[PDB]
Amino acid sequence: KPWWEDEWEVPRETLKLVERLGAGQFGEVWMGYYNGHTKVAVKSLKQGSMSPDAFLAEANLMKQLQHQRLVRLYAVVTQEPIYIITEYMENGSLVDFLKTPSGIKLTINKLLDMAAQIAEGMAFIEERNYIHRDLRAANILVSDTLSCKIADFGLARLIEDNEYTAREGAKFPIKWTAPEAINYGTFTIKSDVWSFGILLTEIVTHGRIPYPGMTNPEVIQNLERGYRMVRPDNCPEELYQLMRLCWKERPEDRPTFDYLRSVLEDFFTAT
Numbered sequence: 001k002p003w004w005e006d007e008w009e010v011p012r013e014t015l016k017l018v019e020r021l022g023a024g025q026f027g028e029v030w031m032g033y034y035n036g037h038t039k040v041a042v043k044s045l046k047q048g049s050m051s052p053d054a055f056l057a058e059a060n061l062m063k064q065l066q067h068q069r070l071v072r073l074y075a076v077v078t079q080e081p082i083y084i085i086t087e088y089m090e091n092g093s094l095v096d097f098l099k100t101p102s103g104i105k106l107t108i109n110k111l112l113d114m115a116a117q118i119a120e121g122m123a124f125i126e127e128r129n130y131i132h133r134d135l136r137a138a139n140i141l142v143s144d145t146l147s148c149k150i151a152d153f154g155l156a157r158l159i160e161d162n163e164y165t166a167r168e169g170a171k172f173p174i175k176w177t178a179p180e181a182i183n184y185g186t187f188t189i190k191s192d193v194w195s196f197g198i199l200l201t202e203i204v205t206h207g208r209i210p211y212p213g214m215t216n217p218e219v220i221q222n223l224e225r226g227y228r229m230v231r232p233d234n235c236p237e238e239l240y241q242l243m244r245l246c247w248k249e250r251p252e253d254r255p256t257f258d259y260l261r262s263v264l265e266d267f268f269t270a271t
């Protein structure tokens with residue numbers, strides 16, 4: 001809809017940017033307030049750093065993916081500098097949170113709880129015929145109540161047919177991406193499942209980089225041999241085997257996110 005008819009467009013005057021949470025090549029993300037009292041996250045686009053349409057495309061997709069387990073779109077300011085305002089998560093990125101004094105003290109029980117919460121969010125994405133493609137601990141946000149939500153939908157895509165094919169030149173984080181995606185540029189929800197497996201290792205190691213001591217070439221070589229990531233230190237064996245399911249050779253053999261959610265919830269209610 002046109003901005004003068006769009007429910008999400010808001011006057012820039014309604015926003016007060018208070019603290020910067022991140023600065024980058026394409027813009028910044030600040031902590032701020034909407035209409036004085038409501039805490040929000042404000043992603044601002046650096047003019048000329050990238051297409052405004054590309055930037056706003058994520059907001060448009062977020063309009064279609066509303067759920068308690070996904071960071072919620074709040075509003076947009078479509079006049080430069082362009083803003084996308086969303087729900088604020090008091091404890092930042094999961095990869096960062098797990099390294100703080102609080103994160104470090106979390107029990108395996110709570111880590112599994114968080115894992116299930118993430119799988120729950122992905123299960124929604126799965127059912128709505130969407131894919132995320134950038135599933136990793138850095139893209140999971142944590143609330144003041146230690147609940148987790150899926151973030152960054154820049155690479156997310158509505159899957160009209162079973163799979164999405166990227167651009168031959170497109171590059172992705174080798175360690176978190178499924179083989180078929182790395183080799184063919186083909187992404188499916190099953191590609192996200194593989195990524196979830198890697199994310200689980202990030203959780204249990206409190207933010208450690210996957211495949212410790214290995215370069216990307218080494219990871220690919222080993223994977224092709226049928227090897228998978230070595231059991232992380234102090235990783236419960238049941239969780240490790242759940243990870244293995246996510247890393248099955250055939251995408252179709254990997255479990256659904258609803259299955260993963262169900263199992264992780266059992267793991268949690270057991271501990």
Ligand SMILES: c1ccc(-c2oc3nccc(NCCN4CCNCC4)c3c2-c2ccccc2)cc1
Pocket residue numbers: 021022029041071086087088089090091092093138139140141151152
């Ligand atoms: C300390 C520090 C940050 C936050 C924090 O609160 C947030 N609320 C909503 C969306 C957010 N971010 C949306 C965009 N992120 C998604 C994850 N990748 C980086 C960009 C953040 C972030 C944030 C911003 C940049 C990088 C990482 C987290 C709270 C406390």
